[PDB]
Design a protein around this ligand. Structure first.
Ligand SMILES: Nc1nc2c(ncn2[C@@H]2O[C@H](COP(=O)(O)OP(=O)(O)OP(=O)(O)O)[C@@H](O)[C@H]2O)c(=O)[nH]1
Ligand SMILES: [Mg+2]
Lengths: 44, 76, 48, 117, 160, 482, 154, 66, 222, 56, 52, 110
RNA sequence: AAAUAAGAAAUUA
């Protein structure tokens, strides 16, 4: 490829390989079981 | 180092000295150390114009040999 | 290079095996040995 | 920086704030703990040594590195040359002296002999 | 380069003791000085208060006096020395000059030619080197002379 | 993931027991399959890449070990340090954790020195030349380099070799104390009664072996005693007599007892004695106590007219110099008098003072790292201010620093105290090492501190871009399979 | 503990909603971690929290991903489920902090702020020197001087 | 120019005595103080037969009552 | 028993010889004594064995992981004598103006200093502030230790600048200096948005609002 | 409470601690008459008298 | 505001309107780009040896 | 408010406890931690915390907060069912009892 | 009372 491409285009950008461009992504994942349906007591 | 590996039965990697030697061995060993130190100093005194020094390995080897001699003497 | 670096393989070769292989390869070429090469080689041996 | 290189305290008399040496450089000099500049740490000197004697490739200072993939540029004349004295730079200084300096420089604005031979 | 608080918080809706918030004149601010500024209780505006205690400019002035005390105090705890007035003759070679008063000239280097650059102002002298000068009457030295370290001596740090 | 294949390498030490369940440290400290030869070409054995530093007796530490890390067993820790440890030293040693020490080159120096002290009478010339005639050393440096730790280590070396050792783990317990009594039988001197009592206690239990053999050459044989109690015949017995009493009696007893203890120490000329004081520089100037205003001494009728201000205004009276503390008096007496070449002071400095830069506000009480620091703000020069030979200590060089950080992180993770199952959130070792270097300046206390703070780094992008690349590679693999 | 006075309790969710400003302020989180580490106990919930929040902060100026309309509402419900997970991961932490802090204060002979429980020592809320002369929630009269939770020697 | 009496003085910052000097503060009057502390020990031994706690004010400290 | 001091492996031997040779050329900072040289060599070998360990732990970790003009390249603006380059940072349009003087350290001990004080002290040891000042050296793939920096505060002075906004301005100053010094380094920097300036300000004071800034006064229906 | 705190400063054998480590009761509590048992006492003092809480 | 309902969030100008697009989010980690490029390239060659 | 002051007092307590060989409070602390630090379970779809109904009060009204508080008041951590505490719970990340911690190490020896 | 150097994210006419 053109030396120009490898000088200017070889960095991470919203074009090339962006880190997530959006709010509210999945930060933390783990392998866990499901909780019971409606574990919260309705109250007061 | 040769002398050292006689005196300590081991290499770089209760024993304070090599075991099972006769007493005459240790006498001759001491003689040998004195001899090495001797020729060391001759060779040094000769070439002194162009400075010559006794590399660390050598010096420390002599010392550890003689220490082994010492501990032989005190166990005996 | 065989001395100081530590080799990363999926089946690591013994120091002695690698040493011998090199030695063999330098003996099969009819090369005249330089003093430095022999010196380095036998420092390999001394500490093995 | 140029003013400070040619600075002499005897010339400062009769000038106002123009007579004051460049703050940072002067205060750095006035500092004694700066005067002792550390040697290039053992790991560093070893690393460089190994690369240029054992491995046959010197370590290039970041300015001598060629960073254009498409060009080869002449290495700047200051590249490995300028040496490191904490007495010179980076500017590091005692707080007492800084206070005194700043205040002096304000109080002296009007002590200027204009008319001089 | 201090991290401490030098500004009194601005008056607002009443602050209460919360995560992340404390009362304005709470005992934990300004080392408990806020006592001086405090009108305790549900203050009845019409009938009661002490006006100066809610005033921004006045309050801030008080706080500033307190900060000044703190600094002064710490600058004096920082001294180990007295100023003695010694006649020109008997003083060390470095002070035999003229020494401009404070904030008058450029902060001044003690001895550039001998490689000492430091404020002459803040140079401190040992009571033991000035002994002959300060207590001539006494005959025998009152303080025994400083013992100094040979920096050429082979000691534990030289690896011998 | 070779987890369920993992067995545990059977326990010889306190240290080997410090390992948590595999599930906790698995990704954080990676497993590997090692194929050796027994009865079949392999039998797969799963080992961990990292293991806690060895647990080494002071006698086993050699020249070859400098800049490495070694561990101290928990019970050795109990044996050798009933006083405590140096100021912050224990912050690296929570209950589950292994107890590490970086063996520095100065550590090796003092280890050699102590090992000679053991039989000093033979080595007298060697020793005296090693300190250049002074009585021992004072170690000085910036805040938060190895000082208090180095002192800890010296206590370890000394007490493992069975030498009688005073250890004052923090000098501030004396000079900046709870309170200050005038000493009972020494006119014009003072005590720190709480410091003194706790000292008399731990000193006794640390040296009890040797101190029970010690016979008293000068102490009165008449000491006041309650019914059913015994006249001390040992130095140990004496120290016991000092601190075991109901208060207030403890208070006067401790005065008498400290005076006689030091009088006994100075009278022993053949048995090596190592005195380790952390923060000597606190003993060489004034304590923070001030002489009582003389009107407390004269008795009073009314405040109305006595010509007395004590109730009206506070005022400062001259500080009590530490040399007028009865304990410090004892020590100074041993330093300054010649004809005591029995005693070795290996001593330390503390720069733990509150920060002051030319303005001070008021410290926020929620966020204050310095609340337990001293108020000092006055300079200390070990050359002019002590009779000891000064030794200087710097920050870690990179060789020390690396070994230390590797320990803090990996042996932390092995003990279940670190990222654990979350290991993929923090960056790799090299990056952490480099960055923590930049932040800390390699100052040891700074390294400890920033190692903890690493939890909060915002701007580290490594695992992000790595994760991204691993993903891309997996999806190309899945497109090639298809 | 220096802050002794009666206080106002805020529901956990509003405390968490402060994000970087308080709940996740780096400074605060670090000395929580210090407390745990010193007690010789892993700080997992703190680390989960720090992870979630770290990332919250990183993307906090971006717009949310574009929503395509669905009769299912699977997207909306999955976003919600993830969100309440994170909320709960942090409730657990918030609980841990209050828990351990109260326990540690019990070991250090510390007196808590007014009307605060310390499990082994003060079961009903501890109070002394309140602006109001009775214990607020018991409605029982307070003794003078302030009640002591610990035996005298120090 | 009238003579030295009018040459203004120099103001030196003279340090307090050093750590090294201050060390001797604990040896000031050493003999007298040891010899005395033995007598004080007698006074203490005796006083401690009567009362549980012996104050310095029963031994070497003077406090004027009236 | 005893341990030997003399070099154990062939590796140690080789490095030990190197250190000797360096000592004979009298290069700065090299140990004159043989004991020091030994300590040095042992320590070095141990460091390299560590590096190999971290690389292995990485390879293993990698498997168990969970999941048109471009940019303006300029010439270098540097003082030919002092070898210094000068950038400026801003935040809040007024409050924070910084100027970084950046110069290359050939001894490899670099340091950053702000208004005459070490960076640690100035930012109050808070890591999440100081790493912002580290970032430009990262993005540019540089070793921060090859550079000396001094930052100068040209804005509103305050006793403590440790806070994230001030740090943003700092990071920017450093990055602009770095770009004047190593021109090509501009392209990574610009893409990671270091050189980019955000324009934000506290609202101007104004007596209409209660707090002086954002809060309108109480309203009642007539 | 005022002269007590001052006397403690002048006894000097505590020295810097009085303001820094030591805690004192708040103003209105410290003003209670000796013998005070219940907190209610603060509110049981006479309101017919203009002492500014300096009355029993 | 005054006795009237608050505007919906979308009726205010953008909260970050004054922050440049290169800042939201920051693309940091540029240092690693080249690295992974080489890596991937290298891997491709590895994956030929298996096949061929 | 947990303060650096408290952290130092904590360190000293922890140390003094280690040296007197008191293992008990460490064990209570370990227990507490083991109980309440377990990983909370991913909620089922359809499960969310209730918001306050619009068109009930005006947006500036107290009722809003009064609801939130009264909700969180009713869900006490003893009512949190999404975190798995109990004797029934298997805890892979943690050590089960006193006998598995390092100060017991002598019994772990063969 | 507030989406403005702060940190809030999904039920238009
Ligand atoms: N294992 C080990 N840890 C060390 C060593 N040096 C420092 N540390 C750690 O780093 C911290 C440095 O703190 P101190 O050693 O107490 O610092 P200091 O020199 O006494 O400084 P000041 O008391 O503040 O004058 C210690 O608490 C140790 O945890 C060391 O040589 N070996
Ligand atoms: Mg210390």
């Amino acid at each position: 490829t053109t030396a120009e491409h490898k000088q200017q285009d070889q960095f991470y950008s919203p074009e090339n390989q962006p880190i997530s461009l959006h709010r509210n992504n999945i930060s933390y994942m783990e392998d866990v079981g499901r909780s019971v349906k409606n574990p919260t007591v309705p109250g007061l | 180092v040769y002398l050292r590996t006689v005196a300590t039965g081991r290499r770089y990697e209760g024993t304070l000295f090599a075991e099972g030697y006769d007493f005459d061995v240790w006498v001759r060993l001491f003689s040998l150390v004195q001899e090495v130190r001797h020729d060391m100093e001759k060779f040094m005194a000769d070439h002194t114009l162009q400075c010559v020094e006794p590399e660390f390995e050598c010096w420390e080897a002599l010392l550890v040999t003689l220490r082994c001699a010492l501990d032989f003497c005190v166990v005996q | 290079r065989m001395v100081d670096a530590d080799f990363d393989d999926q089946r690591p070769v013994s120091e002695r095996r690698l040493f011998l292989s090199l030695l063999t390869m330098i003996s099969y070429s009819g090369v005249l040995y330089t003093s430095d090469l022999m010196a380095q080689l036998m420092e390999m041996v001394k500490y093995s | 920086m140029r003013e400070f290189a040619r600075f002499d305290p005897r010339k400062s008399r009769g000038n106002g704030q123009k007579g004051f040496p460049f703050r940072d450089a002067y205060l750095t000099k006035m500092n004694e703990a700066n005067q002792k500049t550390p040697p290039p740490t053992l790991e560093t000197i070893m690393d460089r040594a190994v690369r240029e004697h054992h491995q046959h490739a010197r370590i290039l200072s970041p300015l001598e590195v060629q960073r254009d993939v498409g060009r080869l540029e002449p290495i700047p004349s200051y590249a490995g040359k300028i040496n490191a004295d904490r007495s010179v730079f980076p500017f590091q200084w005692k707080t007492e002296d800084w206070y005194e300096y700043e205040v002096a420089k304000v109080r002296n604005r009007r002590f200027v002999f204009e008319n001089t031979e | 380069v201090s991290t401490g608080e030098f500004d009194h918080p601005p008056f607002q809706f009443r602050q209460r003791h919360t995560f992340n918030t404390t009362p304005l004149h709470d005992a934990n601010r300004f080392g408990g000085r806020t006592a001086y500024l405090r009108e305790i209780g549900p203050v009845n505006i019409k009938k009661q208060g002490r006006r100066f205690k809610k005033d921004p400019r006045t309050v801030q002035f008080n706080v500033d006096v307190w900060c000044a005390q703190q600094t002064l105090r710490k600058r004096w705890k920082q001294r180990d020395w007295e100023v003695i007035e010694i006649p020109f003759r008997l003083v060390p070679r470095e002070q035999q000059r003229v020494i401009p008063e404070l904030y008058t000239d450029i902060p001044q280097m003690t001895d550039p030619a001998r490689n000492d650059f430091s404020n002459i102002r803040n140079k401190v002298y040992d009571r033991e080197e000035l002994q002959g000068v300060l207590f001539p009457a006494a005959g025998a030295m009152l303080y025994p002379p400083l013992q100094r370290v040979d920096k050429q001596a082979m000691t534990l740090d030289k690896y011998l | 993931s070779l987890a369920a294949m993992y067995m545990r390498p059977p326990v010889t030490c306190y240290t080997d027991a410090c390992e948590a369940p595999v599930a906790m440290w698995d990704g954080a400290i990676p497993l590997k399959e090692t194929r050796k030869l027994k009865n079949g070409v392999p039998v797969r054995t799963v080992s961990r890449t990292y293991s806690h530093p060895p647990q080494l007796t002071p006698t086993q530490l050699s020249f070859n070990d400098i800049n490495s890390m070694y561990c101290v067993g928990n019970d050795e820790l109990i044996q050798f340090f009933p006083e405590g440890l140096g100021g912050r030293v224990f912050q690296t040693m929570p209950p589950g954790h292994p107890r590490g020490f970086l063996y520095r080159k100065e550590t090796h120096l003092l280890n050699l020195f102590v090992d000679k002290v053991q039989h000093w009478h033979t080595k007298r010339s060697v020793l005296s030349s090693l300190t250049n005639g002074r009585t021992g050393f004072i170690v000085d440096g910036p805040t938060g380099c190895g000082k208090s730790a180095l002192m800890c280590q010296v206590v370890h070396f000394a007490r493992s070799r069975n030498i009688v050792t005073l250890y004052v783990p923090d000098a501030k317990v004396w000079t900046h104390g709870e309170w200050c009594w005038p000493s009972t039988i020494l006119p014009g001197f003072f005590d720190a009664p709480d410091a003194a009592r706790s000292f008399l206690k731990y000193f006794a239990v640390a040296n009890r072996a040797t101190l029970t053999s010690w016979k008293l050459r000068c102490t009165p044989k008449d000491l006041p005693t309650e019914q059913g109690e015994r006249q001390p015949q040992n130095l140990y017995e004496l120290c016991e007599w000092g601190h075991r009493a109901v208060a207030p009696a403890s208070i006067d007893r401790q005065s008498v007892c400290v005076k006689f203890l030091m009088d006994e120490l100075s009278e022993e000329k053949k048995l090596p004695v190592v005195i380790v004081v952390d923060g000597w520089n606190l003993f060489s100037h004034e304590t923070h106590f001030r002489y009582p205003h003389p009107d407390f001494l004269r008795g009073l009728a009314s405040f109305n007219e006595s010509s007395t201000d004590i109730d009206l205004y506070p005022q400062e009276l001259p500080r009590i110099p530490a040399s007028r503390l009865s304990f410090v008096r004892g020590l100074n007496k041993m330093i300054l008098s010649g004809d005591d070449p029995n005693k070795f002071f290996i001593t330390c400095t503390t720069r733990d003072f509150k920060p002051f830069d030319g303005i001070s506000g008021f410290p926020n009480v929620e966020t204050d790292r310095f609340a337990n620091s001293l108020d000092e703000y006055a300079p200390y020069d070990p050359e002019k201010d002590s009779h000891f030979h000064p030794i200087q200590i710097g920050n870690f060089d990179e060789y020390e620093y690396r070994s230390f950080l590797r320990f803090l992180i990996n042996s932390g993770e092995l003990a279940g105290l670190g990222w654990g199952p979350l290991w993929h959130a923090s960056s790799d070792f090299e990056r952490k090492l480099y960055k923590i270097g930049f932040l800390s300046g390699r100052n040891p206390q700074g390294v400890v501190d920033h190692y903890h703070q690493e939890l909060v780094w915002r701007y580290d992008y490594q695992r992000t871009r790595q994760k991204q690349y691993l993903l891309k590679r997996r999806m190309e693999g899945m497109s090639r399979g298809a | 503990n220096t802050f002794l006075t009666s206080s106002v309790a805020t529901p956990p969710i509003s405390v968490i909603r402060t994000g970087p400003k308080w709940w996740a302020d780096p400074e605060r989180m670090v000395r929580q971690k210090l407390m745990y580490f010193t007690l010789g106990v892993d700080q997992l919930p703190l680390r989960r929290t720090a992870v979630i929040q770290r990332d919250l902060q990183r993307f906090h100026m971006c717009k949310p991903p574009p929503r395509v309309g669905d009769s299912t509402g699977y997207k909306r419900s999955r976003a919600a489920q993830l969100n309440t997970w994170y909320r709960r991961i942090q409730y657990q932490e918030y609980h841990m902090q209050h828990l351990f802090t109260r326990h540690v204060w019990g070991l250090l002979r510390v007196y808590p702020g007014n009307t605060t429980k310390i499990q082994g020592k003060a079961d009903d809320g501890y109070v002394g020197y309140d602006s109001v002369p009775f214990h607020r929630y018991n409605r029982a009269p307070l003794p003078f001087p302030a009640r002591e939770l610990y035996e005298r020697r120090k | 120019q009238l003579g030295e009496e009018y040459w203004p003085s120099v103001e030196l910052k003279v340090r307090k005595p050093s750590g090294q000097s201050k060390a001797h503060y604990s040896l000031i009057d050493n003999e007298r103080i040891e010899k005395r502390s033995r007598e004080l020990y007698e006074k203490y031994r005796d006083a401690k037969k009567r009362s549980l706690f012996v104050t310095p004010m029963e031994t070497w400290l003077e406090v004027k009552g009236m | 028993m005893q341990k030997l001091l003399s070099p154990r492996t062939a590796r140690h031997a080789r490095l030990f010889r190197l250190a000797g040779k360096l000592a004979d050329s009298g290069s700065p900072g090299v140990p004159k004594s043989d004991g020091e040289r030994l300590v040095w060599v042992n320590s070095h070998v141990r460091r390299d064995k560590d590096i190999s360990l971290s690389q292995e732990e990485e390879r293993i970790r990698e498997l168990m992981m969970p999941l048109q003009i471009g940019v303006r390249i300029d010439e270098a603006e540097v003082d030919p004598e002092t070898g210094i380059a000068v950038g400026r940072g801003c935040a809040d349009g007024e409050k924070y103006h910084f100027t970084a003087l950046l110069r290359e350290n050939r001894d490899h001990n670099g340091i950053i200093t702000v208004m005459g004080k070490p960076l640690s002290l100035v930012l109050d040891n808070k890591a999440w502030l100081m790493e912002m000042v580290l970032m430009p050296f990262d993005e540019a793939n540089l070793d921060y230790r090859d550079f000396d920096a001094h930052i100068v505060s040209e804005g509103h002075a305050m006793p403590s600048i440790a806070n994230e906004i001030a740090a943003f301005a700092l990071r920017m100053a450093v990055a602009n200096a770095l770009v004047k010094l190593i021109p090509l380094t501009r392209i990574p920097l610009k893409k990671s948005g270091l050189l980019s300036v955000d324009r934000r300000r506290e609202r101007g004071q104004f007596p209409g609002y209660l707090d002086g800034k954002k809060v309108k006064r109480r309203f009642a229906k007539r | 409470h005022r002269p007590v705190k001052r006397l403690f400063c002048n006894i000097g054998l505590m020295g810097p601690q009085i303001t820094t480590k030591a805690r004192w009761k708040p103003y209105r509590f410290a003003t209670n008459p000796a013998g005070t048992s219940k907190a209610e006492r603060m509110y049981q003092r006479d309101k017919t008298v203009y002492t500014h809480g300096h009355n029993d | 505001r005054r006795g009237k309902p608050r505007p919906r969030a979308g009726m205010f100008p953008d909260k970050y309107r004054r922050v440049p697009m290169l800042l939201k989010p920051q693309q940091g980690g540029q240092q690693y780009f080249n690295h992974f490029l080489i890596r991937s390239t290298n891997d491709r060659l590895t994956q030929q040896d298996v096949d061929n | 408010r947990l303060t650096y002051d408290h952290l130092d007092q904590l360190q000293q307590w922890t140390m003094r406890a280690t040296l007197d060989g008191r293992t008990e409070e460490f064990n209570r602390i370990r227990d507490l931690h083991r109980e309440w630090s377990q990983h909370p379970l991913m909620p089922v779809l359809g499960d969310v915390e209730p918001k306050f109904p619009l068109n009930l009060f005006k947006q500036n009204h107290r009722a809003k907060k009064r609801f939130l508080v009264r909700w969180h008041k009713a869900n006490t951590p003893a009512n949190w069912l999404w975190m798995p505490r109990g004797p029934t719970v298997v805890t892979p990340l943690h050590r089960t009892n006193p006998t598995q911690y390092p100060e017991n190490w002598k019994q772990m020896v063969q």
